[PDB]
A paper describes a structure:
Cyclic dimeric guanosine monophosphate (c-di-GMP) serves as a bacterial second messenger that modulates various processes including biofilm formation, motility, and host-microbe symbiosis. Here, we show that iron regulates c-di-GMP levels in Pseudomonas aeruginosa by modulating the interaction between an iron-sensing protein, IsmP, and a diguanylate cyclase, ImcA. Binding of iron to the CHASE4 domain of IsmP inhibits the IsmP-ImcA interaction, which leads to increased c-di-GMP synthesis by ImcA, thus promoting biofilm formation and reducing bacterial motility. Our prediction results reflected that ImcA contains six membrane-spanning domains and a GGDEF domain while IsmP is a multi-domain protein comprised of several domains including the PASPAC (IsmP273-413), GGDEF (IsmP413-585), EAL (IsmP585-865), and CHASE4 (IsmP59-220) domains.
To further investigate the interaction mode between ImcA and its substrate, the substrate analog GMPCPP-bound ImcA homodimer structure was determined using Cryo-EM at 3.07 Å resolution. ImcA is primarily composed of two parts, such as the N-terminal 6TM domain spanning from L47 to E231 and the C-terminal GGDEF (equivalent to DGC) domain containing residues from R241 to A393, which are connected to each other by a flexible hinge loop. Our PISA analysis depicted that the inter-ImcA monomer interface covered an area of ~2656.4 Å2 with a solvation-free energy gain (ΔiG) of -48.6 kcal/mol, which corresponds to a strongly hydrophobic interface. Nevertheless, it’s worth noting that no polar contact between C-terminal DGC domains was observed. And considering the existence of long flexible hinge loop, ImcA DGC domains presumably may keep undergoing high-speed vibration in a local space as reflected by its higher overall B factor and worse electron density map compared to 6TM domain. The nonhydrolyzable analog “GMPCPP” of substrate GTP adopted a relatively extended conformation when bound to the catalytic pocket. Moreover, the ribofuranose 3’-hydroxy group (3’-OH) also formed a hydrogen bond with the sidechain carbonyl oxygen atom of N276 in chain B. Consequently, GMPCPP was finally attracted and anchored to a narrow stripped positively-charged surface with its purine ring stretching to the hinge loop, meanwhile, crossing the top of the conserved 310’GGEEF314’ motif in DGC domain. Furthermore, Mg2+ was not stabilized by β and γ phosphate groups of GMPCPP, but also D268 and V269 in D-riched motif 268’DVDDF272’ together with E312 from 310’GGEEF314’. Interestingly, there are two extra symmetric ligands found in the vicinity of the cytoplasmic side of 6TM domain, which is not reported earlier. Compared to those located in the DGC catalytic pockets, the GMPCPP adopted a relatively bent conformation, interacting with fewer residues via polar bonds mediated by R26 and N45 located in front of TM1, Q219 and Y214 located on TM6.
Residue numbers in the entry:
A (entry chain B): 15 to 392
B (entry chain A): 14 to 392
């Protein structure tokens, strides 16, 4: 089981196998549709709050040109925010949003510094140094991106935020911006702790549900289908077979003389071979809508879909030969040097239930097992 | 079913478990969060040390020596507080004490963040690191192992102090800057609350899943009592323990008689229905200490007994046989009575004797009870 082995060996440093990671990314994108809706809404609200704050804070009568330039930049992203808005709600193109989400964030960061880079252009001192911080925290919003995607994005944002102040506004406020950029560095580090626990929990919650579902779908010792799933699926198979008007053939597999194997070879060794029986039974089960299941204990049942009586006899004979050709020693057998297998085949028609076919299948094995080696009766 | 499975099916939006589950979860949270306190103490010591360096970096000691001294006293005070709480957090013996002051420790850190600022306006010097108050809020969201609502209510209280101190002790010269920064900090809390919710929700589902996955796989059964493989581990351990203290172990196998009639006349859902009442009445009849009851597979089950004599084993076998006989279930196809009949086989084990020998004797008596018209118990 690919899911089980990933959980056992651990997934530290937050990385799956190539196929599992691709499945996880689809899982991440599927469950982050609601988060994208909130992220677009909050970004529109935040930038709207920036505009009203700027107008009510800076005087226009003395610096009208500065106000006009700032107002153009802010509305520019707001209009650009309404053009990426149709690309985040339509499910038809949600895939492209996985690659443009970094584009839609770093561009927002670009405008955050653009508003400040104009206060010193017009010779007006700043009134809030917390603008740069809110652009950085937008990176950590849960847009369904991975751990390393968000982390590498904020670090790039941090570098660009530091760069804009070094080449601009020189010999003025340099100490206060460098400290604020340094303070932001701690902001990124603190948020990295929390995001790590989020992504680690998310992956191992995804791994659990896949493993839990598979475990209930199959049995444990072998890879066949457990009892309660087999009953439900066979009823669906019978209903489907009646819908398309074609008979369903049932063949049951039973091991003969298992006390001798148990008491002479040991309890763990006696059925250690059960997996070997499972694989050689499964390799003979490759047809479409052809199932392999264990009914609990020594006896197994496999269901054939759209097969004729000649085919059922042919496939039953070769699997009996195949298990005989395995040649596992079993000294207590009265029908051969090695362990022997009994088969019982029954045919089911449309509108005829599971109970009747099982009744029509059991005594063929009973008449075969007794006074018989590996005989098969229809 | 399981309490863990019950919660998962019910759902846990708003992040609240049952009282017993939440107490287990909180202990689970504290156990796994022990490593996080190592980093939390490290960063808080490092951050406050860096605050001291920054304050001395530019503050004019010549012009304002009193301001520098007062700030230096406050910052070293919490570092002293960090060195007195540090021995109370790394010791596993009082880990409950270590997180008994976690809201207390964070609030004090927030207090010094504002106290090392308001003194700038006390001495008439404009501040230079308005971002300082924000760092006192982000400390609340550090993964200290607290619950979701504990962190959320803590940061909101820290938000209140920022607004209160700047409106009252913040004078009137830099107010318009203060409310803007406090309003921006409100967005900081809101943004971090989104990520916090996903963290706690993802964590809680795992604990329900891990408890459910482990218990269903290793232990228990879908309808029965215990998995066959786990029964084998217990039986080997019980035999090893029994041989160590030199006492016999009694084994009893319970079998259903004439099950073909029940299956083909009453149906499969009736057949598995007969199983689960059979399981519960066998479970209620198994109350001895270190008593193992399991579903081996198919129709037969085995119960393991520790420190019992032949008379007790025969006595308990008879009453459960009468109990299941007293249970009125229509099994009209029976050839041994009006209702379904149950066969039992009891075997005794000695010291240093393998499970195959006792199992062979146990089933041997079972068939010799079967051919005797059922309803028989043999040793
Ligand atoms: N059982 C749990 N283990 C957890 C939980 N959170 C973290 N961990 C542990 O985190 C481990 C991840 O590997 P590391 O120790 O390298 C992770 P790091 O040291 O960077 O941070 P922690 O996750 O705080 O240990 C993993 O072995 C888990 O046992 C949790 O909620 N439950
Ligand atoms: N290790 C395991 N042993 C099993 C399992 N299921 C059944 N058994 C063992 O197999 C036996 C039950 O099957 P039967 O007694 O009907 C075996 P036998 O081949 O003699 O039956 P017929 O061929 O129908 O006469 C019994 O010894 C069980 O302990 C299993 O999943 N694992
Ligand atoms: N299968 C997953 N569901 C998730 C994940 N993250 C969030 N959710 C969903 O979160 C939901 C729990 O919250 P509610 O249903 O009350 C809606 P709320 O807005 O509070 O949460 P979200 O649905 O996460 O926005 C739940 O239905 C999940 O489907 C995830 O990683 N996997
Ligand atoms: N509904 C279920 N039927 C089961 C289950 N396990 C076995 N069986 C049925 O039990 C039958 C196997 O034969 P049994 O060992 O029950 C023999 P029975 O008690 O009918 O006759 P005696 O040998 O005279 O005691 C067969 O019809 C199986 O389908 C199970 O978990 N559920
Ligand atoms: Mg058999
Ligand atoms: Mg029987």
């Amino acid at each position: 089981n690919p899911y089980a082995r990933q959980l056992r060996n651990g997934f530290r440093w937050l990385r799956f196998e190539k196929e599992l990671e691709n499945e996880f990314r689809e899982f991440l994108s599927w469950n982050s549709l609601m988060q994208r809706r909130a992220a677009i809404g909050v970004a529109f609200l935040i930038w709207a709050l920036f505009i009203v704050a700027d107008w009510m804070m800076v005087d226009i009568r003395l610096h009208p040109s500065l106000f006009e330039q700032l107002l153009g930049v802010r509305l520019g992203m707001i209009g650009l925010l309404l053009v990426v808005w149709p690309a985040a709600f339509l499910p038809s193109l949600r895939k492209v949003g996985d690659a443009i989400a970094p584009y839609c964030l770093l561009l927002i960061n670009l405008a955050v510094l653009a508003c400040d880079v104009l206060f010193e252009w017009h010779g007006v001192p700043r009134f809030t140094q917390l603008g740069a911080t809110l652009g950085i925290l937008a990176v950590f919003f849960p847009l369904g991106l991975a751990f390393w995607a968000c982390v590498r994005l904020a670090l790039l944002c941090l570098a660009l935020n530091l760069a804009v102040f070094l080449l601009f506004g020189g010999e003025e406020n340099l100490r206060t911006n460098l400290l604020n950029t340094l303070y932001n560095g701690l902001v990124v580090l603190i948020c990295s702790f929390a995001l790590y626990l989020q992504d680690y929990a998310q992956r191992e919650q995804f791994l659990g549900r896949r493993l839990l579902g598979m475990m209930a779908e199959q049995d444990s010792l072998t890879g066949l289908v457990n009892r309660r799933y087999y009953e439900l699926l066979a009823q669906r198979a019978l209903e489907q077979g009646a819908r398309e008007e074609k008979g369903v053939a049932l063949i049951l597999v039973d091991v003969d003389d298992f006390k001798a194997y148990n008491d002479h070879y040991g309890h763990p060794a006696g059925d250690a071979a059960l997996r070997q029986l499972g694989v050689v039974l499964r390799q003979g089960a490759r047809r479409p809508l052809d199932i392999a299941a264990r009914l609990g204990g020594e006896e197994f049942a496999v269901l054939l879909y759209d097969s004729e009586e000649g085919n059922t006899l042919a496939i039953a004979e070769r699997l009996r030969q195949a298990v005989e050709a395995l040649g596992i020693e079993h000294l207590g057998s009265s029908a051969g040097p090695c362990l022997t297998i009994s088969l019982g085949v029954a045919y089911s028609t449309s509108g005829m239930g599971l109970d009747a076919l099982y009744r029509e299948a059991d005594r063929a094995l009973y008449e075969a097992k007794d006074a018989g080696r590996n005989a098969v009766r229809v």
